């Protein structure tokens, strides 16, 4: 059994569309346990100034009970069957999924449908969650990494929809109405914009059957079955500096505009990010790590950690890096980090990509380690590519990448571009934008 053969012998992903426009996909295995859920193409980006934080507010009630079954009843039923009910809401994507015994795939599907369609939106529960959410905002306000990424979007996409955070504003949370949440749900949780995904030991035909039975409510007009294209979010080379010398370490995030899901270049960017990789003070590897930046970080004690990223979206994305450092080592870190980015565009090696490619393969294989992670892939894939992409296709694409390709693609999105910068904490040593902007050319 060779890597290739194992990739080809992986069960295919089945997809079937209902008349209402919903899509049902699943990957079959021989596991007594499974995961199934509905991936909705909704999120903060779809909200506006008045209902920002609604999709999040909803994410809080999506588990507090439906019309057919109030809170206690809803919970008991799920708990008593050993099933796990989780989910999340992001900027362009939302999800509600359940982990359970394949033996219950059908009852689950019924439960899912009931959650996405008949949420009780208990008037009293709403005021109760209003206070919970407000506490979660204070908890997250201490999460530098997330404060930093929020700020990164706040400036990189200033003036637009991606600038908003997923959780929403304090004013919105304090005044969102039972009607607003309701409106949100009806406006966005719609068949053509949803995907019923499942993985494990399940019959695609049994899945699609229960699907037909519970995901009904078809649409009449044309405006109800058309998936709205969102208005473009303008990228802006800029920076937001939130200084507080009272914080122990500083977080910095720099990024250029990314291509967006459908673009093939993304395979190259991910290889590129693989070369620079990531690091943190507990990587036993130490000073021998392959990632040059990681090596320098260790030798010069440049940071506590650093990480690259290539966040995608429908029509845009953020390609960059983030690091945490002591107030006195920020400048050298940023220096080396930008240095490496220059190296990418200019002097990438075949060896470098050979390694990065292997690293990338095992990384994609890791994101399919369990029923939930695989289910997440399916949901996301159909929702972003409108079709599942096998590990064999990815590997096909990854294999085509070479040093020259990395250089051209990287030169394309990085070289001499105006980045977006977010710095939080004791950031006095971080030099100005103009200085950083110069680190964008020559290497």
């Amino acid at each position: 059994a060779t890597y290739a053969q194992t990739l080809q012998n992986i069960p295919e992903t089945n997809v079937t569309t209902l008349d209402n426009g919903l899509r049902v996909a699943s990957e079959e295995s021989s596991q007594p346990t499974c995961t199934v859920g509905v991936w909705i193409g909704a999120g903060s980006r779809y909200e506006n100034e008045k209902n920002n934080g609604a999709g999040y507010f909803v994410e809080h009630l999506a588990f507090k009970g439906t019309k057919k079954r109030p809170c206690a009843a809803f919970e008991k039923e799920v708990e008593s069957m050993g099933a796990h009910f989780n989910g999340y809401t992001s900027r362009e994507q939302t999800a509600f999924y359940i982990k359970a015994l394949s033996k219950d795939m059908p009852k689950v599907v019924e439960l899912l449908a009931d959650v996405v369609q008949n949420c009780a939106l208990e008037e009293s529960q709403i005021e109760k969650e209003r206070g919970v959410i407000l506490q979660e905002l204070k908890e997250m306000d201490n999460d530098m990494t997330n404060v930093t990424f929020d700020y990164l979007h706040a400036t990189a996409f200033q003036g637009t929809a991606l600038a908003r955070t997923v959780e929403g504003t304090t004013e919105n949370i304090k005044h969102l109405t039972r009607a607003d949440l309701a409106s949100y749900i009806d406006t966005h949780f719609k068949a053509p914009r949803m995907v019923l995904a499942a993985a494990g030991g399940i019959s695609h035909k049994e899945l699609v059957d229960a699907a037909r039975q519970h995901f009904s409510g078809v649409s009449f007009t044309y405006k109800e079955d058309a998936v709205p294209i969102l208005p473009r979010c303008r990228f802006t080379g800029s920076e937001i500096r939130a200084r507080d010398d009272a914080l122990p370490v500083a977080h910095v995030a720099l990024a250029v505009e990314g291509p967006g899901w459908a673009d093939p270049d993304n395979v190259v960017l991910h290889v590129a990010n693989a070369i620079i990789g990531r690091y943190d003070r507990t990587f036993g590897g130490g000073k021998h790590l392959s990632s040059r930046l990681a090596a320098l970080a260790v030798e010069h004690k440049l940071c506590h950690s650093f990480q690259t990223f290539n966040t995608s979206y429908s029509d845009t994305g953020l390609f960059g890096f983030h690091f945490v450092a002591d107030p006195l080592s920020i400048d050298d870190m940023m220096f080396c980090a930008q240095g490496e980015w220059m190296r990418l565009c200019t002097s990438t090696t075949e060896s470098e990509v050979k390694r990065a490619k292997n690293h990338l393969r095992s990384a994609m294989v890791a994101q399919l380690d369990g029923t939930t992670p695989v289910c997440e892939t399916i949901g996301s894939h159909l929702l972003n590519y409108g079709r599942r992409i096998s590990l064999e296709e990815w590997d096909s694409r990854i294999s085509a990448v070479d040093a020259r390709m990395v250089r051209d693609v990287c030169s394309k999105y990085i070289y001499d571009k105006c980045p977006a910068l977010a710095a939080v904490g004791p950031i006095e040593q971080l030099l100005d934008y103009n200085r950083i902007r110069s680190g964008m050319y020559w290497i």
Binding site: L296, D332, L431
Partner: protein, 55 residues
């Protein structure tokens, strides 16, 4: 020692600490321009002076 020469080299270190990374007030006006102009007259005078001195 340091990752970038601009800071480790014993000579550049000096150029960096006085003409590149030197911290300067963000709001100094045109009145703070005469220091550098004075320096340029000096170099200019010396250069033209040697040239004249040679004849």
């Amino acid at each position: 020692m340091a990752p970038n020469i601009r800071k480790s080299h014993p000579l550049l270190k000096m150029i960096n600490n006085s003409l590149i990374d030197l911290p300067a007030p963000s709001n100094i006006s045109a009145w703070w321009n005469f220091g550098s102009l004075l320096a340029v007259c000096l170099m200019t005078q010396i250069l033209t002076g040697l040239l004249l001195a040679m004849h």
